[PDB]
Write a protein that binds this ligand. Structure first.
Ligand SMILES: *[C@@H]1O[C@H](CO)[C@@H](O[C@@H]2O[C@H](CO)[C@@H](O)[C@H](O)[C@H]2NC(C)=O)[C@H](O)[C@H]1NC(C)=O
Ligand SMILES: *[C@@H]1O[C@H](CO)[C@@H](O[C@@H]2O[C@H](CO)[C@@H](O)[C@H](O)[C@H]2NC(C)=O)[C@H](O)[C@H]1NC(C)=O
Ligand SMILES: [Ca+2]
Ligand SMILES: [Cl-]
Lengths: 206, 420, 206
């Protein structure tokens, strides 16, 4: 039995994909206990595991839902005219739309500049749940945690960079550090504060 | 916003009624100007017939009739009119086509004329942005012979979605200012129940509209004399073309605007998604999407995952089992929970009653001892792991009074404290 | 990785406990950068704080030292075959031996008998550093501090009693009081003297 052909895969939302096909096996219809029932298979495109996730439908289009944002997926289709099935169709591919991140960057470290005081080299790692291409890294730092979250010192890092230099930091002073990730579809949540205390003047010698 | 009242619970909302034709470019197949030909204006102020001709070039702004004159500001005092050239009779037809860009719910579509109305015209609609075309309305004195449609056939429940042909509005008696009005819901059984009629909701839906002018009119067989004065009087001309309707949004959007791709799309509300609000926006798959009626707004409701899932998908079985209330299954339940709504802790985890179920650490690890406990799953209230014989402790990590752990992994503690 | 099993805990001295275990994970040995290294954890058994106190060893027995006399202790063990550790073993328990007290009883009070003169009711409280079960309370009293420490009036109190009646004490006379605690492994130090002066005869009326 000829498997369905003309399989399309259209990204709808950051979780939904519309697959559509056509069946050239069209007889004198419509009857009755042998209605052509299609099955839509799908999994993560080109991956390590991916045990598929099928679903039945009698129409010529199914919409996969609950997919992961910013993810390519494999889509194949079969047809079953009881009691005679077909092989799987040619796989179509689609990548779900992006979405605002749902996590904060990890490995947020603050290293003192060498051998310049007053300056540090912040480093970090992109968030696991980016849900898109990171376009900017908004960084915050201040010398008092009692003040609101917004009125710190906001600095916008390039987004393709994981290291930023902050300068003119008072000596013998405790600083706080928070960082969030940003993409095309919005900005993620801030990380948990990470305290760093600058050195004293009489400690730089020597 | 008219998509919710003052409380404000969601309520059905539709965009404003508009002239979808107004200001838009209309592709044609015939226009006077290239090359500049003569057109005659037959009238009768008194009796019999008169004739007043003029020239029609396109390079001159005054005596030109471009396709822009169909969809421009039409003041009745000075009719900005369009016309064709010239004797496109039969089977030569001249067509008018416009692309709306999005699915509209077409109420009417009207054409006022400068020249006498044609003996036969056809109105075609599209529901897939132009790739296919279906008949909307036919006008002809001889419908059976022209369009193979029964003359003014009845409309019942079955043929309700089928275009009809009428002989009305066809006569040329109003040689000027003729009107061709097509009502899409005119005389159709389910019209008074439109909010509950998918057949009529589909019928009024159109992406593109094509007007096909077929046969022309003549004065009692006085045109077969191919005169350079006679045939230069028979032509098609419309002063204004309108298409009444509104953006199709299934009552889930109060307005439609153009996004980043410059494509007209409904500003969806009620947690809906898609071009015509035909879907549920992500994580709102609890109950099936459906069109909003005047009675119920039918807003998509968010999946209940107790803050332990970002993705979900609808399940019809679970929905029916829940008595049609919640059929949205949560996917990849994080925070070490289980269930179709992430409402309890998975195997090997007990629920910390100090925190609500929505809390991030609402579930705590059993930490049942590999050799002390008999299993991974512990009590959900206290947390006491299944302890083997001679083993005690919450996590079964020590021996009971009078016992002592052995060198056997499947027989721990069992060694009874013997008197030296 | 299976944690060590057959953990024993043997009290040695009033500060030392021998823990011993066995490891059934025995391969073709002995080599080389992955020698099975055990870690012996211990803390005060069933307590309020007890931040543990581990120590490494490659043998199948460790001896905890410097423990508190007369004290129960929790003992667990883990095994590390780099770079793969195991969970902690089942905890074994042991109570260090007792030792002679290293402090004197506190709250040593002398109250006059009512309404009998010549008699008092000494009361006190067990010493903090008992280091065992108190078996006897040796009490001393006299009417002159110039005499040696031993030749007072020595009276042996039951040990489970914190009150003792002393009688036939001269009126209008200053008496001294000292008390030490005794257990299985010896006797503790005496307390600091506590002076008490009996009433005069003409004061009992009325
Ligand atoms: C169509 O084109 C123009 C209409 O303005 C006519 O010729 C122009 O105007 C005068 C004649 O009135 C000429 O001298 C110019 O050279 C033309 N200018 C331009 C820009 O075309 C022309 O004759 C018209 N065609 C016919 C057949 O009448
Ligand atoms: C009106 O006439 C036009 C002009 O010929 C028709 O357009 C043709 O349609 C047929 C139908 O398949 C095609 O094979 C031709 O190629 C078309 N012509 C051109 C030039 O492309 C049109 O279909 C007619 N309208 C009707 C019949 O409703
Ligand atoms: Ca006009
Ligand atoms: Cl969605």
């Amino acid at each position: 039995m000829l498997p369905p052909v003309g399989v399309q895969a259209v990204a709808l939302t950051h979780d939904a994909v519309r697959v559509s096909w056509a069946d050239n096996s069209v007889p004198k219809n419509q009857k009755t206990s042998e209605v052509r029932l299609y099955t839509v298979r799908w999994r993560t495109s080109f991956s390590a595991s991916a045990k598929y996730k099928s679903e039945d439908t009698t129409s010529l289009s199914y919409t996969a839902t609950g997919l992961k944002p910013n993810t390519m997926y494999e889509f194949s289709v079969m047809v079953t005219k009881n009691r005679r099935s077909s092989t799987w169709s040619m796989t179509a591919h689609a990548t779900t739309y992006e979405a605002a991140p749902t996590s904060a960057p990890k490995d947020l470290t603050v290293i003192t500049r060498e051998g310049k005081p007053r300056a540090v080299i912040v480093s970090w790692q992109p968030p696991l749940e980016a849900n898109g291409k990171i376009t900017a890294y908004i960084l915050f730092y201040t010398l008092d945690k009692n003040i609101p979250i917004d009125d710190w010192i906001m600095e916008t890092i390039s987004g393709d960079r994981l290291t930023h230099q902050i300068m003119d930091l008072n000596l013998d002073t405790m600083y706080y550090f928070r960082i969030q990730a940003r993409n095309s579809k919005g900005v993620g949540p801030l990380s948990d504060p990470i305290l760093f205390r600058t050195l004293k003047l009489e400690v730089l010698f020597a | 916003d008219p998509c919710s009242d003052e409380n404000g619970h969601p309520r059905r909302c539709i965009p404003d009624f508009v002239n979808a034709a107004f200001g838009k470019d209309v592709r044609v197949s015939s226009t006077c100007g290239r090359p500049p030909a003569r057109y005659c204006v037959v009238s009768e102020r008194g009796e019999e017939r008169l004739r007043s001709c003029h020239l029609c070039n396109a390079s001159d702004p005054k005596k030109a009739h471009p396709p822009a004159f169909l969809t421009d500001l039409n003041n009745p005092h000075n009719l900005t009119c369009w016309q064709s050239e010239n004797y496109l009779q039969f089977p030569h037809n001249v067509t008018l086509t416009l692309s709306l860009g999005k699915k509209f719910e077409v109420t009417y579509v009207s054409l006022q004329f400068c020249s006498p109305r044609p003996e036969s015209m056809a109105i075609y609609k599209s529901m897939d942005y132009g790739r296919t075309w279906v008949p909307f309305q036919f006008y002809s004195t001889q419908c059976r012979k022209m369009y193979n449609r029964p003359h003014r056939a009845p409309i019942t429940k079955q043929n309700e979605q089928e275009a009809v042909c009428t002989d009305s509005h066809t006569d040329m008696r109003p040689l000027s200012g003729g009107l061709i009005a097509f009502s899409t819901l005119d005389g159709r059984p389910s019209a008074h129940d439109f909010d509950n009629s998918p057949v009529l909701q589909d019928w009024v839906t159109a992406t593109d509209i094509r007007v096909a002018f077929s046969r022309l009119h003549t004065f009692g067989d006085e045109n077969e004399d191919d005169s350079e004065l006679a045939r230069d009087s028979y032509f098609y001309a419309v002063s204004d073309l309108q298409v009444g309707g509104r953006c199709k949004c299934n009552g889930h959007a109060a307005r439609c605007v153009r996004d980043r791709d410059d494509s007209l799309v409904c500003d969806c509300r009620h947690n809906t998604a898609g071009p015509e609000c035909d879907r549920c926006k992500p994580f709102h798959y609890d109950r099936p999407w459906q069109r909003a009626t005047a009675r119920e707004a039918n807003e998509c409701v968010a999946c209940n995952c107790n803050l332990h899932a970002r993705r979900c998908r609808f399940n019809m079985e679970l929905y029916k089992l829940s008595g049609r209330k919640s059929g949205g299954v949560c996917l990849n339940c994080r925070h070490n929970t289980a269930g179709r709504h992430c409402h309890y802790c998975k195997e090997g985890y007990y629920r910390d009653m100090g925190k609500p179920i929505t809390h991030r650490k609402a579930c705590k690890a059993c930490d049942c001892h590999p050799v002390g406990a008999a299993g991974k799953t512990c009590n959900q209230t206290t947390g006491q792991c299944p302890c083997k014989d001679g083993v005690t402790g919450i996590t079964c990590n020590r021996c009971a009074k009078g016992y002592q752990q052995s060198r056997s992994p499947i027989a721990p503690c069992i060694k009874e404290l013997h008197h030296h």
